């Protein structure tokens, strides 16, 4: 009952661009239960898988999604199984709830042995970028069985408090985005560099107003940090954590390129048929979806996609399609998992609206075309972070996307869980 | 359902009777917009007006103020171009700010320029006092 | 003269043809009373029934509408004690807001709240429409 | 003809409380004389009295008291003389009206030598108190002699633009009551402090809920601006003024100690029997009277009455007698004087009703008993603001109360002055 990862050569794929309705997703939620009185509200997603496992995490409210009061702080893990139908779902087999809810943040995953390795930024101060200036820049991992022994000390779940951090010219350093890769015994999550504001080195002149009639050069600086007068810009990159490197390995944050230069926004590293892709979501004024293959890790270089199809809603000054460098920071997370390299054919659930977030449609796509889609629900449905991972099951391609999404009046605001194989034949 | 907002001196539901007061149900959408005056069509004013318009608490909006650091909806630079924005009334959105509207709070939008270049980046009460410039926002229990 | 309001669904007063209307002299007082109705006496109601009266400009009270920062007279927290609130038509008073009754004007002494303690801060026509609470004030040229 | 202020051991007044009419006010307005035609209302009442001299004020409304357009504002100095029959009477030296009645506010005198000094809030956007975040935080002085020279002049009329204001950690200061005290050639005005209320500085559970079910905690810390969601909150003290300190004086704003600390009200700074006592107007839901024995002055702290027995009338939330707690910025200004510091005996106009302006009556009293009084007029007669100062003439103690006051159908709306004896004898 295996799903494996993305790898090789898969069955085919629909390659055309077509308006049939080949695209049949299915609702799996129910696998993950999930219980919460009337006005609870659960946010802060994140699913991650590999080689057949998956991690979890979401943060339980009580009141608005934005600033209701948290209630409890899941992460937890599990296999992904077929469930006799044919058909991939999520099965837990350990979770792990945190004393205090209101000090964790940002966590980001990856599996390398029998266990995912959950790390986490640790705050008394809020989220640690909406008060920069005021974190301890502390961190934590936690490790868990991705098949929980029954009983044997430290196996099952584990601690690390986090000491050492190579965080060169930056001042703090944390996890920013769902899931990361392992290479061997190295550990790759994504993250984002705190720099002050003062130090970040940067000739005006490479703003792209070329064709831009009120982007003024100064823009894209100051679309580095969440203000214009920000304390901080943020630089997203990769955090390194060498399994080997010891009892207590350091944790080594690698910039980001200066190609194609968004604002450190939450990002995905993963693999796909042999190689790893890199998604940063577009929290400024390029927004256009930003992935591509990653060239080198160490050196941290991703070749983004020329594509001009993709985007998010943002608010008015940088709404979807916005490709003039504007002072700003707003969008969501719709990340994009690639399911073809030959042909460069990625899938997705974006969201078909330019200021508002709403409409959840899960596309397959190319850089200058969508071949297919398929509309998860309504078009005034309200949804928001997604999450899409890939793989295969008896090599057929599936996908699984996490979406945040509700339409207006439900009691319980949750997120909910997609299956969605994808179609050998264009037809019918 | 709702009727969208021309921000600019020729709307006249700014200085009318009640004083511009909406009542959006849960999952309406509002639409703010800043339009052309250029080449000047219909529901544009006199000349192109500079405005900043902002989200604010309700005892703001009677002191015409708004914040230090303050919920900046749309920014009215371009005397091109028409400007829109919109909200949903609803608990997702593309703001990475984490506001939130309460039960039974009465919100204000407000603009707090002079209407001005120069003087667009005023906080306190410009054209929000001088055009009657506010509209009042009472959100579905 | 003029007689006590008595707050409540019990009055009946309201549910009356024209819609209790008062005429109030100049130098007339007037109460308005949210009776016990824990130890249920007499002119209180089946159930306590919490409520916020404002005064409201006349055309709002039609309406049924308050204004934002209203003119809240009287609060019926209390179900354990009687509450009272005595005005007299006069031109001093213990209010420090400089409020001002025209004469040949209208005013209504309306309440927008459901009459539910999770209803209370609601400032749009509550019992004032489904129970017909308010009532018009005349006052003496 | 010879006022001089209330010190050391005057003649005996009684000491008994009492039923019999004792007290004989009598009615002395003329001697200050003030017109108007119909429909005209006299409002903004201001009375100081020292050294047998005094000042006055007040705003002559078209309209209502409260909103009637402004047609004039009058400062006024003059003296306490022995009328011939034995009983004071005001007798006015020196008027002085400014150009603008709708700019001047919150007039506080102080009397000097040979000159009254009067502070005033300049303003072009309506009542400071009203307008906060839009008043300038402009300040006034006026210096009249309460002798004229004649063709003097500066000697008569003259006025300081005030220059330099010491006002802390507050944003604006302002005079809030009718008069002050001296010592030697420093003025101290009552005054009020607009603090920004986010930075106000209170332990929530200083508040004393202890024996009132229905009173949160938060009630306090609200109570202390005009609305709870007011921008500033009001902190009551002192305005101190150097006379020997340049030709250019500096304003310095003394707050109030945070015992029983209530919302900053028009208060009253005065001396009797040879040391300054304190009180400050009960605007919400500490409605007994609030006044003592200033303890001292340049850190101001006043050792208020455990008083029992007088209070004001308020409106719903915070009526007469209101101990506990509320949310609310509601009372009447009705100050109170000492006469006999042995035994701690004050007397002053009282409005007789729990939540209507009306029934003005002075009485006599001590901490925990009301003496002995005297209606000044009917039960539903109107009345408001009292101001209240008392000395000796003939070595026998004599008050004088400025009563806001009418009945309903008169023409002319005006404050009204009662000379009241405080009897020796307990009988006829
Ligand atoms: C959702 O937001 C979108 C983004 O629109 C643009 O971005 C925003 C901010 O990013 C700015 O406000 C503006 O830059 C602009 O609005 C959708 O915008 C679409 O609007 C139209 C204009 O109304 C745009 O028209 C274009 O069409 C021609 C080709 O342009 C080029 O092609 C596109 C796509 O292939 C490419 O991205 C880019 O390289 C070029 O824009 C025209 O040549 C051109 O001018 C027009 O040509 C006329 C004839 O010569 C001439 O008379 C006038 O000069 C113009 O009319 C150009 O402006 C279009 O590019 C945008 N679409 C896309 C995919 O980007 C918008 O969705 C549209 O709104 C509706 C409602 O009215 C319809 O226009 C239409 O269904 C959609 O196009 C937003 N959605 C809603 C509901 O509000
Ligand atoms: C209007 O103002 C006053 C309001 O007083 C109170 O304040 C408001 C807000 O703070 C609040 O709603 C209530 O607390 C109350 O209205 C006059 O109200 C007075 O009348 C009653 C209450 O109705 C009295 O309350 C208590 O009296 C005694 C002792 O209480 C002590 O002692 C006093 C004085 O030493 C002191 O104030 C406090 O230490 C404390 O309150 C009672 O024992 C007590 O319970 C009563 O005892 C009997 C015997 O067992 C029981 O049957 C039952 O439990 C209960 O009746 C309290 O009830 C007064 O305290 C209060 N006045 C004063 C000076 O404090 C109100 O006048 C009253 O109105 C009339 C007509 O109805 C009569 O009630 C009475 O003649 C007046 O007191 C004023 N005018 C009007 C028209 O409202
Ligand atoms: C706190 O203090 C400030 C004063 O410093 C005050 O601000 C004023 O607010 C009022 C509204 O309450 C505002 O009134 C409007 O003014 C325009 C007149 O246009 C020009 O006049 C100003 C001086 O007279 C000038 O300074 C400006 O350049 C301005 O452009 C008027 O058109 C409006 O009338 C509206 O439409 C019709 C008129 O026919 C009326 O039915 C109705 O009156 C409508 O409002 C309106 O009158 C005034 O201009 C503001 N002045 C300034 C300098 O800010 C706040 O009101 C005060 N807040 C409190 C609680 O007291
Ligand atoms: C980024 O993060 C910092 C924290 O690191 C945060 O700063 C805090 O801000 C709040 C006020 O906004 C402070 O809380 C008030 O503190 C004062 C007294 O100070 C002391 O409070 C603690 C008591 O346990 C101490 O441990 C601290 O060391 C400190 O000395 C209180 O008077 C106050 O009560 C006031 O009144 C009512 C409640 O009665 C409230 O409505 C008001 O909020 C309040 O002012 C509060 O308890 C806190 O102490 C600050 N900490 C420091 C080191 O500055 C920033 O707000 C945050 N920025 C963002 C954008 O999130
Ligand atoms: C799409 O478009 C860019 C530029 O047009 C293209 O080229 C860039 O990427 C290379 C690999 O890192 C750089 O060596 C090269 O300098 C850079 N182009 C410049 C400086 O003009 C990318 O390849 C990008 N990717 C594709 C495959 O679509
Ligand atoms: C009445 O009120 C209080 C309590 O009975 C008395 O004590 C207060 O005043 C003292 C200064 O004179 C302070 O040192 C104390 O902190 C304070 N005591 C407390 C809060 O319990 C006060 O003397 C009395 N006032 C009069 C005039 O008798
Ligand atoms: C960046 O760009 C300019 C012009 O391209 C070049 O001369 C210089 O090296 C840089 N300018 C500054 C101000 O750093
Ligand atoms: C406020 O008061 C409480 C007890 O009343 C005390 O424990 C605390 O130290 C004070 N300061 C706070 C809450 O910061």
Not at chain 1, 399 to 413: F, K, M, P, R
Not at chain 2, 72 to 87: A, G, N, S, V
């Amino acid at each position: 009952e295996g799903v494996s990862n993305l790898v090789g050569l898969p069955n085919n794929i629909c390659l055309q661009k077509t308006s049939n309705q080949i695209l049949k997703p299915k609702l799996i939620s129910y696998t993950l239960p999930v219980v919460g009185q009337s006005g609870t509200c659960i946010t802060d997603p994140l699913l991650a898988m590999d080689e057949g496992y998956f991690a979890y995490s979401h943060l339980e409210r009580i009141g608005s999604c934005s600033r209701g009061v948290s209630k409890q702080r899941i992460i937890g893990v599990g296999e992904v199984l077929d469930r006799g139908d044919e058909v991939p779902s999520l099965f837990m087999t350990n979770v792990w709830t945190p004393p205090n809810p209101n000090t964790v943040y940002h966590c980001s995953a990856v599996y390398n042995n029998e266990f995912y390795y959950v790390l986490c930024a640790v705050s008394t101060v809020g989220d640690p970028i909406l008060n920069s200036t005021y974190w301890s820049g502390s961190l934590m991992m936690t490790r868990l069985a991705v098949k929980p022994k029954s009983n044997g000390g430290g196996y099952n779940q584990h601690q690390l408090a986090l000491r050492s951090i190579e965080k060169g010219r930056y001042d703090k350093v944390m996890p920013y985005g769902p899931s990361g890769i392992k290479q061997g015994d190295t550990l790759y999550f994504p993250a984002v560099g705190f720099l002050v504001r003062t130090e970040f080195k940067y000739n005006d002149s490479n703003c792209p107003i070329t064709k831009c009639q009120y982007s003024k050069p100064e823009n894209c600086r100051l679309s580095m940090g969440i203000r214009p007068n920000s304390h901080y810009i943020l630089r997203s990159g990769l955090l390194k954590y060498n399994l080997s490197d010891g009892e207590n390995p350091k944790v080594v944050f690698i910039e980001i390129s200066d190609q194609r230069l968004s604002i450190g926004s939450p990002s995905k590293i993963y693999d796909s048929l042999g190689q790893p892709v890199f998604y940063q979501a577009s929290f400024s004024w390029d927004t256009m979806i930003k992935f591509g293959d990653v060239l080198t890790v160490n050196p941290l270089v991703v070749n983004w996609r020329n594509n001009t199809v993709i985007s998010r809603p943002g608010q008015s000054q940088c709404p979807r399609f916005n490709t003039c460098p504007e002072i700003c920071w707003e969008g969501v997370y719709n990340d994009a998992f690639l399911i073809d390299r030959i042909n460069w054919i990625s899938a997705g659930v974006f969201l078909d609206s330019n200021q508002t977030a709403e409409n959840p449609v899960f596309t397959v796509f190319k850089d200058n075309e969508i071949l297919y889609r398929a509309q998860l629900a309504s078009e005034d449905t309200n949804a928001q972070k997604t999450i899409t991972n890939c793989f295969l099951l008896k090599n057929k391609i599936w996908c699984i996307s996490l979406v945040e999404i509700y339409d207006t009046g439900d009691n319980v605001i949750r997120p909910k869980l997609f299956a969605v194989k994808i179609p050998e034949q264009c037809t019918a | 359902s709702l009727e969208p907002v021309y921000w600019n001196s020729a709307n006249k539901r700014f200085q009318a009777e009640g004083g511009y007061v909406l009542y959006p149900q849960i999952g309406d959408r509002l639409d703010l917009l800043c339009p052309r005056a250029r080449p000047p069509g219909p529901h544009s004013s006199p000349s192109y007006e500079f405005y900043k318009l902002y989200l604010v608490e309700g005892a703001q909006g009677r002191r015409c103020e708004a914040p230090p650091a303050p919920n900046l909806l749309l920014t009215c630079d371009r005397p091109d171009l028409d400007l829109r924005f919109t909200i949903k009334f609803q608990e997702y959105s593309p703001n990475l700010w984490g506001h939130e509207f309460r039960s039974h709070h009465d919100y204000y939008i407000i603009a707090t320029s002079d209407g001005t270049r120069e003087g667009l980046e005023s906080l306190q009460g410009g054209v929000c006092l001088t055009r009657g410039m506010k509209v009042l926002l009472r959100v579905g229990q």
